[PDB]
């Protein structure tokens, strides 16, 4: 899932 790659990036960046 190519989008999940960025998904966890976003998560770890923004949320914590």
Q: How far is Cα 1 from Cα 12, in angstroms, rounded to an integer?
A: 17
Residue found by looking up tokens 């990036």 in the block: 9
Q: How far is Cα 13 from Cα 2, in angstroms, rounded to an integer?
A: 17
Tokens read off for 3: 């989008």
Q: Computed over its alpha carbons, how large is the radius of gyration of the chain?
A: 7
Contacts of 12 (CB under 8 A, 6+ apart): none
Buried b or exposed e, range 1-16, using 16+ CB within 10 angstroms:
eeeeeeeeeeeeeeee
Contacts of 7 (CB under 8 A, 6+ apart): 1
Helix (H, G, I), strand (E, B) or coil at 1: coil
Residue found by looking up tokens 């960025």 in the block: 6
Q: How far is Cα 16 from Cα 14, in angstroms, rounded to an integer?
A: 6
Q: How far is Cα 8 from Cα 15, in angstroms, rounded to an integer?
A: 10
């Amino acid at each position: 899932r190519r989008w999940r790659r960025w998904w966890r990036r976003w998560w770890r960046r923004w949320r914590r």
